[PDB]
């Protein structure tokens, strides 16, 4: 058999990979976030210069397989205050935003269509009527609670996914005093937080998610897993047309490979490219978290400058990055 | 099985006497002289345990055995247990 630290080998009790540990809080650092939620689209292979001192491929180039995760900006819909107790952390109270998008309202219902859409109705009414209760609760969190987690949901509509329920979750707000975290959450109420503001493509992060099920084996598969030290290679912007165009390559193109991502679609929003494989198949939600413990060796610290990113047809033996140059080489078709 | 389980010195031979168990030289310590001399085992005089053992020449505790004393034949009593000590340590009858 395998390692005894992973048994009992049973199905994960959650579709979305839940964070089990957040980086330790620091008052010296100002107020920011630590985790983000994305959707796996697939991976390609890229050619990257190797600036690895002491290595035998120093000042050379290697080919690396890199997973692409679409990460549309996340909407902060609430905040949760946690108070330390002799029996552990306890959720003291929760404050939600006044207006919640249908994407996050669909989470509370198994049948949103048959529902009367009554979620947060009186909550929105009391929010508009009197703000003294909201002020009392926020003052309660900043005075008593020691850990602050913002409720954020993903804009699943932008992703080419048939699912319309947003994966609501909590992001621990590490940095500054408790009042600073509360002020940060209130300012960011109803707004959007971007992965460009959270991660910046040169740090060492961990990816967590549920693996894909292999059926029945002599149970094997569909288990919660935590990959450590997955390096971000590029946080590409969806709007920019140079997202998949490096400086050594030009050739204006998009990260979505020609022919589309297999069983996922076309990536149009901000995407994240991580070195190596990540758990879960395509179209499954993955969670990203910062480094709990600081460890930047040369591999985790060296800068990265991509040279060429493959966008060939992953469906089948693709042999052309873009239909433009495909038509330039291939003879003119009958159509 | 039928064999001699004790160290000895070499129909009538109904049992089997192991060659390894058999011993031919005995360390005899003189009484007056107080010196141990390795003399050949000329023969077994009498074994108080059993006349058959005496006939078979089994070297046991208290058995009388004759050894050459020309370099010093005289009898001697075995004061040790050859089956356990591994050596035929006896004291001269003098």
């Amino acid at each position: 058999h395998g390692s005894l630290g992973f048994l009992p080998r049973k199905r994960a009790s959650r579709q979305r990979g839940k964070v089990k540990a957040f980086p330790k809080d620091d008052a010296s650092k100002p107020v920011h976030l630590t985790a983000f939620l994305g959707y796996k689209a697939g991976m390609t292979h890229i050619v990257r210069d190797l600036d690895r001192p002491g290595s035998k491929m120093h000042k050379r180039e290697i080919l690396e397989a890199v997973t692409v995760i679409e990460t549309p900006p996340m909407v902060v819909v609430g905040v949760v205050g946690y108070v330390e107790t002799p029996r552990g952390l306890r959720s003291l109270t929760t404050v939600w935003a006044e207006h919640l998008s249908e994407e996050v309202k669909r989470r509370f219902y198994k049948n949103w269509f048959k529902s009367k859409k009554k979620a947060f109705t009186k909550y929105a009414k009391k929010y508009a009527e009197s703000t003294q209760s909201i002020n009392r609760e926020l003052e309660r969190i900043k005075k008593y609670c020691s850990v602050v987690r913002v409720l954020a949901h993903t804009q699943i509509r932008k992703t080419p996914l048939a699912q319309k329920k947003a994966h609501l979750m909590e992001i621990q707000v590490n940095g500054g005093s408790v009042a600073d975290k509360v002020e940060w959450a209130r300012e960011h109420f109803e707004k959007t937080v971007d992965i460009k503001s959270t991660f910046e493509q040169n740090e060492m992060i961990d990816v967590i998610g549920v693996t894909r099920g292999k059926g029945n084996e002599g149970n094997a598969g569909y288990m919660h897993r935590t990959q450590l030290n997955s390096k971000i290679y590029r946080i590409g912007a969806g709007d920019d047309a140079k997202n998949a165009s490096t400086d050594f390559d030009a050739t204006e193109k998009r990260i979505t490979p020609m022919g589309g991502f297999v069983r996922y679609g076309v990536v149009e929003n901000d995407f994240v490219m991580l070195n190596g494989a990540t758990p879960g198949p395509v179209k499954r939600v993955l969670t990203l978290r910062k480094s709990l413990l600081t460890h930047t060796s040369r591999k985790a610290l060296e800068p990265v400058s991509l040279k060429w990113i493959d966008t060939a047809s992953k469906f089948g033996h693709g042999r052309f990055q873009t239909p433009a140059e495909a038509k330039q080489f291939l003879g003119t078709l009958k159509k | 099985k039928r064999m001699i389980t004790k160290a000895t010195f070499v129909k009538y031979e109904r049992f089997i006497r192991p060659m390894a168990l058999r011993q031919k030289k005995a360390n005899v310590t003189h009484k007056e002289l107080g010196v141990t001399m390795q003399l050949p085992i000329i023969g077994v005089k009498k074994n108080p345990q059993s006349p058959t053992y005496t006939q078979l020449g089994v070297l046991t505790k208290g058995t009388v055995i004759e050894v050459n004393v020309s370099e010093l034949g005289k009898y001697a009593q075995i004061t040790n247990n050859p089956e356990l000590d591994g050596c035929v340590n006896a004291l001269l009858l003098t």
Binding site: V31, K196, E200, T294 | -
Partner: protein, 35 residues
């Protein structure tokens, strides 16, 4: 070879936290924070 729980290795990890780490990561968080 020594394992990851080597007491000296933990000591050297602590020493290198304030040498090739820490400060360059704190301001790195600050930059995307003010963003």
């Amino acid at each position: 070879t020594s394992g990851p729980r080597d007491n000296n290795r933990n000591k050297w990890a602590k020493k290198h936290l304030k040498k090739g780490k820490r400060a360059k990561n704190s301001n790195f968080s600050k930059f995307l924070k003010k963003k």
